[PDB]
Amino acid sequence: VQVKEQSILELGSLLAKTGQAAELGGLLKYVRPFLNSISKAKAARLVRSLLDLFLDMEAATGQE
Amino acid sequence: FSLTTFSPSGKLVQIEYALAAVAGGAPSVGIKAANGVVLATEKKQKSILYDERSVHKVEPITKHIGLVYSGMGPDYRVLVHRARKLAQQYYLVYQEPIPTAQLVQRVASVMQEYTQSGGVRPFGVSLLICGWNEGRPYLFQSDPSGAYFAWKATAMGKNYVNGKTFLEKRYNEDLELEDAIHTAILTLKESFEGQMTEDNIEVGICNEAGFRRLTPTEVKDYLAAI
Amino acid sequence: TTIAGVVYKDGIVLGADTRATEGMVVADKNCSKIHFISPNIYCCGAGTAADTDMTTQLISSNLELHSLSTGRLPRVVTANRMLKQMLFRYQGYIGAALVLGGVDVTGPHLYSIYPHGSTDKLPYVTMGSGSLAAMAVFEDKFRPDMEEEEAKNLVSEAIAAGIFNDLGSGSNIDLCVISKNKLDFLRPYTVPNKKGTRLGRYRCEKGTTAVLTEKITPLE
Amino acid sequence: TTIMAVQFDGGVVLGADSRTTTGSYIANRVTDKLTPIHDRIFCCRSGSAADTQAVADAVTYQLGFHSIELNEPPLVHTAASLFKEMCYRYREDLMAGIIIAGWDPQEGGQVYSVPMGGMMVRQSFAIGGSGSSYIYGYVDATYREGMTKEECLQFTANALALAMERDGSSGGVIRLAAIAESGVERQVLLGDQIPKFAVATLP
Amino acid sequence: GTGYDLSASTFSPDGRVFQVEYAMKAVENSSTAIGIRCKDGVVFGVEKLVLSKLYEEGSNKRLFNVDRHVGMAVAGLLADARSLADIAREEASNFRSNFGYNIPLKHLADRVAMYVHAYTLYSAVRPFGCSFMLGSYSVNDGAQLYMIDPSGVSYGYWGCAIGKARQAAKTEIEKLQMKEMTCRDIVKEVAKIIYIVHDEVKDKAFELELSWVGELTNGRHEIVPKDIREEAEKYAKE
Amino acid sequence: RYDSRTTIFSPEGRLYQVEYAMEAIGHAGTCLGILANDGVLLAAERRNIHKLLDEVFFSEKIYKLNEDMACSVAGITSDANVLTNELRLIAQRYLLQYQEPIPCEQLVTALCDIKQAYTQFGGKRPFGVSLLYIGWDKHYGFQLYQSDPSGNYGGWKATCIGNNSAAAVSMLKQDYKEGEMTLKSALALAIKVLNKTMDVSKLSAEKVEIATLTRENGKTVIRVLKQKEVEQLIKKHEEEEAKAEREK
Amino acid sequence: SIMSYNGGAVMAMKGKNCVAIAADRRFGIQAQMVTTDFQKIFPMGDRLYIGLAGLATDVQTVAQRLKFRLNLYELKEGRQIKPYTLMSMVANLLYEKRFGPYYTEPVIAGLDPKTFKPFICSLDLIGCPMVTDDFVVSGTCAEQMYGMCESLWEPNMDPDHLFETISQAMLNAVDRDAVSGMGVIVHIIEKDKITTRTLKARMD
Amino acid sequence: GFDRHITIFSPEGRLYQVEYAFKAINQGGLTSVAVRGKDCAVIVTQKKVPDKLLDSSTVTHLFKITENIGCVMTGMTADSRSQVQRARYEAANWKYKYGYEIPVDMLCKRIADISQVYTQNAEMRPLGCCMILIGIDEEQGPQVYKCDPAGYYCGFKATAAGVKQTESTSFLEKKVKKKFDWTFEQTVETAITCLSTVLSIDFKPSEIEVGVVTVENPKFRILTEAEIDAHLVALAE
């Protein structure tokens, strides 16, 4: 049941490797139900990691 | 004389000294969450010579009763051996009640050979007990002389005061899911001096499914993302 | 009462009947004659049922305590030694005849325990009043290092022979299969004996059974 | 069942049947009646199987502990003393015939008998069990002095075979144990390998 | 010590048992003894102070026979020494009754030493005020000789001495070349060593109790024939 | 020299160890029992009310010890637990022997005999615990008893055993009226005296634990008043206080 | 024989979310009745009863001792007894006297305090539990109750028909036995009520 | 007072009797080292023999507790022998009660429980001898444990006990922190060089007595003069 969150982590890792911004933003805006279904700490740290990876490369200063 | 003794006018001087010794230094926090109970403790071995998979601080006294302790580990063993024998005797007499949480209160009460018969020298360990065979969890504390305290969250370490302060400030709360073990590890962090790791920190969880001492794999998993 | 056990390739298979009788009258039709000891060892009972149950529960509790203290899996040899000491202490006053089976780190083991304290390690064991039929079935159709399904079938055949050839045993077949990684209880594995349906509505409606007086005490 | 021991130069040879009777039904046709009390000391059990097992295990306890506390292999005489004490103090409750044998550097191959009652005696050869009473004449007539290892092995195997074939409480397979300074070698004779003296009575 | 040297159950601040440290002093004060493992046996010897000529021929002899082949030469508080000798006799008898044959000396010394240590462990009972050599011989195990101090443990000794003058005796013992000298010349030399040790320089006349065990006695630890060892005492005198 | 306990007299002739224990019973704990017709009740002060407890034992001071009685300790909890266990064992042993509920006075006499033995012989500490008992029997009806560690019990009808026991008993003497006393007015008196002896006014229902024993139809019912009922009692008391204060 | 010294016959049966326990109310030495209101059904709780059969003295002693242990346990725990736990407690109490056993054959009939699950069990003199879901009995005419029940019992039976069946079985069995009878008491335990009935039985 | 005289808790909240008893082990003038290895577990203690009238054959401090467990004592020899006898009794009794041989960890646990009972109560006193026992355990490899006069049984890979135990532990900590497994040669050489660096006498192959338990060879080999000499020659090469 947690394999879905593993897949979310894997997709985020590939998005960070490629340099995608819109796809990562959509994934972050989509995974919210899965965030509000698991351990608060684990979901929070996943959110933090995804946000940091998104803000790393693509410098959309008007959107970040 | 040959019991829990040395009580002057309005005091229990020997018991008070025993509690001064149980001040100890192993934080050993405990949290009673809605789904279950977490007993986490710090295994800070002197040097790397000692081993961590050799000796344990968390002991499953029975199927879903887990136990953690404080100073005087040699006394704690004997105490946990006695507790195992007591829970087993109760289960043998009242046959097949799968007794853990309707037995957690009872084993905490039978923790009177714990201290009310001290044994010339009273025990020097305060122990937290967790059980979930009632549809509800239970976290109890038994101290070198007192009795079942029925905590919701506490610590028994060198910095147990600020540990308990941290627990209440971080709102042990009542809606917390089973994964309040993160908060337990945070509470330890406060009473911990080092980069805590899987072998450094030992934690057991007792949920309605049963009790289980978390292996270093899961402990490290939880310690990651902290 | 007919219980039996065999050592198959990957572990042990235990089987038992479920007929607990008082004298010559069937009392229990689903008496569990196979008792858990540790998640890797079971043991089949025969003889005085109460003595067997108390002894096996005491052994199971002591062995669980021992396994908790050691931190490792228990051992069938240890269970045998405990049972043998306990029985020989009472010199057979404990009318319990046991068939211990288990899987240890050193390989599957199967032992027979007699009320006077005798024990022995055997590839196949039978015990109880109808033990002779099951022993004969093993002697006829026993093959060493025989697979899981074949061993289950062999034990089922032996138990069925005991059931149908001893009146004081039967009604059901209880099975347990244990290996290095599997513990599977089966309970009624095969019911070769079914009660015929009652012809006609042989029931009494209300109004009959005249009562002298009645008291009702409602609760909360 | 039948149990037998022979002492030769530099070792002993033990032979036992594999049958244990209960009434008229064969409880265990492959019984292992050669219990190793220690590394170089063996026990042959007869009578109440439970009592024999309990006595042998208690003696193995005491003997192993005693050997460990001496840092020296125990004497066969010491083992036989342990058996005689155990049997004699509880003879009214324990009914068992025991044949002890083994090898120790102090004396060498030794054989002792402790039947029901609790008496100890050192013998060149020992014989006991239910089926023993049927081969006394054979074992006494066909025993030589200074017999070697193979001679003793074959002679004991023959005596056990005849005891099995004659006595109704004895049968199954034969277990042999050769004890010497080199160690203990245990072998099993089964089926066709059993030395058979066929009795083809004429029609 | 002062505060900590009252009961053996009280450890010292440095971690020592002053009750035993004081019980050793009684052995240091009492008259000496000696035992030498000859080539094929063990020879004992102990000077006994005849505190008054009122006493008969040598009585309360520091030698004792604990078993058929085993002998005990004791020094220190003689009453507790005798009680301990009785303990040793009982132990040997029990071992003979249980395991048969004769009790090996190493095991006998170990058991009596564990018994002694039991008496220093606790508080209600006090450590024994005696130190003794146990000497024995057999064909199988040669000759053995173990010394037990008031609280310590048995130790294998080629030659040992205990009592008032341990070092003075041990110097000449080590001067003597054992392991190739027969028990006869050893019986002469032990008397020589005892007489070298002070007997009347500050004390009274002393009696020479000498003991034997060895193949010359086929085991059977017995007191040396004093009539024929009076000449050995004479050779010691010279 | 070895340590020997003190179960001895005084040069004057006093058992000062027992007296010190009895005085220490006043220190820590607070219980009070008020006897009334058709119902006798106990009030207890919840000393430690830390928010990290869960209150799953359902009772700390009040202990049900028998079908027809209930006690309340005010001593060291270590001794209190074993004393309650022995008390229940005594009551149930009497029930086994006579097939009849044990009279309260006989129960209290047995317990005080055990405490008297504990202070009498051997090198054993006196049981530093004093407890009340409320009960009902066939012979005397509702009864209330107070036992001190001295083993010298007393049959009371309105008493307190806690820290400010002097103040509580003075309040009870001032506002106690026998005969007219009933269950509800007994409850009002109990909550009033508890409010007096607990300095913080407007006592929370969590800090007060009270249990009433009543006689239903041929059956004794010992009901521990739960939080809602207790705070409704508190509200009624508050209305009475406001009315009395304002009417002047 | 000895178990038939004072007679006795106790039945227990299961309905749909309800149980029933019945017993003869005869007490007497070998041949004579002494009284017709002897008590063999004892309430261990609001929804849990025990039946005892055997020597009358052992019946009373076991009932009293069990009540003592149960009262102690209830005081210790604070929660009501589960019928399985009580059956286990009875088994332990019986086995404590393995070599001097109380010649009684107890049966347990009750409902779970929360799930209201019917539970009927029987024990031998030593204390072997025989938990089933249809019926158990004990006494001198246990075979008669078996013969009657095996045809008169129906699974998932309403409490009224359960009472009818248990009453019929008890009445016929106490009519066909020689030592027990002269009145049958029956208790029907529902989720909220107890129905205690004294059947019209052959007083001879 | 008597806080420091009997086994009672100190007002400061300590237990001074066992704290003293630990220093009794340092008393007696001896040291011992134990090194767990990749497959074997080797221990070694110095053999302080004053004067040759003693029997170097029987002055040893290492013993066989059972066929696979070997122990080294440190401290007062009388208590050491008493605890060795107790451990042997426990091993035999365990083998009698349960069929399989007693695991070393379980044996150390039982010895520690006995010592904990001793530090409990007040009639008896703790035994001043710390015991390092080693043995091969299946599914565990070599195993080393240390029971102490208190009752705390633990200790692993590299553990030492005696007067100069701290220096030995420090050196062994350096060696284990150096991440490389010791084969049935490096383990022995490590133990030897550890003890030699602690007490530099170059260790003539007569003043130490080493015990070895390998996996392919079980049993507690009390290595002979020739074996220790060969290891010393190979090490000093």
Curated annotation (Swiss-Prot), chain A:
Induction: By FOXO4; expression in embryonic stem cells (ESCs) is mediated by FOXO4. It is found in: Nucleus; Cytoplasm, Cytosol. It comes from the Eukaryota. Phosphorylated by AMPK. Disulfide bonds: none annotated. Changing residue 37 to A: Does not affect phosphorylation by AMPK. Highly expressed in embryonic stem cells (ESCs). Expression decreases as ESCs differentiate. Component of the 19S proteasome regulatory particle complex. The 26S proteasome consists of a 20S core particle (CP) and two 19S regulatory subunits (RP). The regulatory particle is made of a lid composed of 9 subunits including PSMD11, a base containing 6 ATPases and few additional components. Component of the 26S proteasome, a multiprotein complex involved in the ATP-dependent degradation of ubiquitinated proteins. This complex plays a key role in the maintenance of protein homeostasis by removing misfolded or damaged proteins, which could impair cellular functions, and by removing proteins whose functions are no longer required. Therefore, the proteasome participates in numerous cellular processes, including cell cycle progression, apoptosis, or DNA damage repair. In the complex, PSMD11 is required for proteasome assembly. Belongs to the proteasome subunit S9 family. This is 26S proteasome non-ATPase regulatory subunit 11. It comes from Homo sapiens (Human). The gene is PSMD11. The chain holds residues 43 to 106 of 422 of the full protein.
UniProtKB/Swiss-Prot annotation, chain B:
The modification Phosphotyrosine is found at residues 17, 69, 114. The modification Phosphoserine is found at residues 7, 9. Gene3D superfamilies: Glutamine Phosphoribosylpyrophosphate, subunit 1, domain 1. The modification N6-acetyllysine is found at residues 63, 164. Its main location: cytoplasm. One of its GO terms (cellular component) is secretory granule lumen. One of its GO terms (biological process) is response to virus. It comes from the Eukaryota. Phosphorylated on tyrosine residues; which may be important for nuclear import. It is found in: Cytoplasm; Nucleus. PROSITE patterns: PROTEASOME_ALPHA_1 (PS00388), PROTEASOME_ALPHA_2 (PS51475). Keywords: Acetylation, Cytoplasm, Nucleus, Phosphoprotein, Proteasome. Induction: Down-regulated by antioxidants BO-653 and probucol. Down-regulated in response to enterovirus 71 (EV71) infection (at protein level). Belongs to the peptidase T1A family. The 26S proteasome consists of a 20S proteasome core and two 19S regulatory subunits. The 20S proteasome core is a barrel-shaped complex made of 28 subunits that are arranged in four stacked rings. The two outer rings are each formed by seven alpha subunits, and the two inner rings are formed by seven beta subunits. The proteolytic activity is exerted by three beta-subunits PSMB5, PSMB6 and PSMB7. This is Proteasome subunit alpha type-2. It comes from Homo sapiens. The lineage of its organism: Eukaryota, Metazoa, Chordata, Craniata, Vertebrata. The gene is PSMA2.
Curated annotation (Swiss-Prot), chain E:
Keywords: Acetylation, Cytoplasm, Host-virus interaction, Nucleus, Phosphoprotein, Proteasome. Pfam families: Proteasome, Proteasome_A_N. This is Proteasome subunit alpha type-3. GO terms for biological process: proteasome-mediated ubiquitin-dependent protein catabolic process. One of its GO terms (cellular component) is nucleoplasm. The modification N6-acetyllysine is found at residues 53, 202, 226. InterPro entries: Ntn_hydrolases_N (IPR029055), Proteasome_alpha (IPR050115), Proteasome_alpha-type (IPR023332), Proteasome_asu_N (IPR000426), Proteasome_sua/b (IPR001353). It comes from Homo sapiens. Belongs to the peptidase T1A family. Disulfide bonds: none annotated. It is found in: Cytoplasm; Nucleus. Induction: Down-regulated by antioxidants BO-653 and probucol. Up-regulated by bacterial lipopolysaccharides (LPS) and TNF. The 26S proteasome consists of a 20S proteasome core and two 19S regulatory subunits. The 20S proteasome core is a barrel-shaped complex made of 28 subunits that are arranged in four stacked rings. The two outer rings are each formed by seven alpha subunits, and the two inner rings are formed by seven beta subunits. The proteolytic activity is exerted by three beta-subunits PSMB5, PSMB6 and PSMB7. Interacts with AURKB. Interacts with CDKN1A. Interacts with MDM2 and RB1. Interacts with the C-terminus of TBXA2R isoform 2. Interacts with DNAJB2. (Microbial infection) Interacts with HIV-1 Tat protein. The keyword Cytoplasm applies.
Swiss-Prot record, chain H:
GO terms for molecular function: endopeptidase activity; NF-kappaB binding; purine ribonucleoside triphosphate binding; RNA binding. The modification Phosphotyrosine is found at residue 152. Pfam families: Proteasome, Proteasome_A_N. GO terms for biological process: positive regulation of canonical NF-kappaB signal transduction; proteasome-mediated ubiquitin-dependent protein catabolic process; proteolysis involved in protein catabolic process; regulation of inflammatory response. One of its GO terms (cellular component) is ribosome. InterPro entries: Ntn_hydrolases_N, Proteasome_alpha, Proteasome_alpha-type, Proteasome_asu_N, Proteasome_sua/b, Proteasome_subunit_alpha6. The keyword Nucleus applies. The modification N6-acetyllysine is found at residues 95, 97. The keyword Phosphoprotein applies. It is found in: Cytoplasm; Nucleus. The modification Phosphoserine is found at residues 10, 56-57. Keywords: Acetylation, Cytoplasm, Glycoprotein, Nucleus, Phosphoprotein, Proteasome. SUPFAM superfamilies: N-terminal nucleophile aminohydrolases (Ntn hydrolases). The 26S proteasome consists of a 20S proteasome core and two 19S regulatory subunits. The 20S proteasome core is a barrel-shaped complex made of 28 subunits that are arranged in four stacked rings. The two outer rings are each formed by seven alpha subunits, and the two inner rings are formed by seven beta subunits. The proteolytic activity is exerted by three beta-subunits PSMB5, PSMB6 and PSMB7. Interacts with ALKBH4. Belongs to the peptidase T1A family. PANTHER family: PROTEASOME SUBUNIT ALPHA/BETA (PTHR11599). This is Proteasome subunit alpha type-6. It comes from Homo sapiens (Human). The gene is PSMA6.
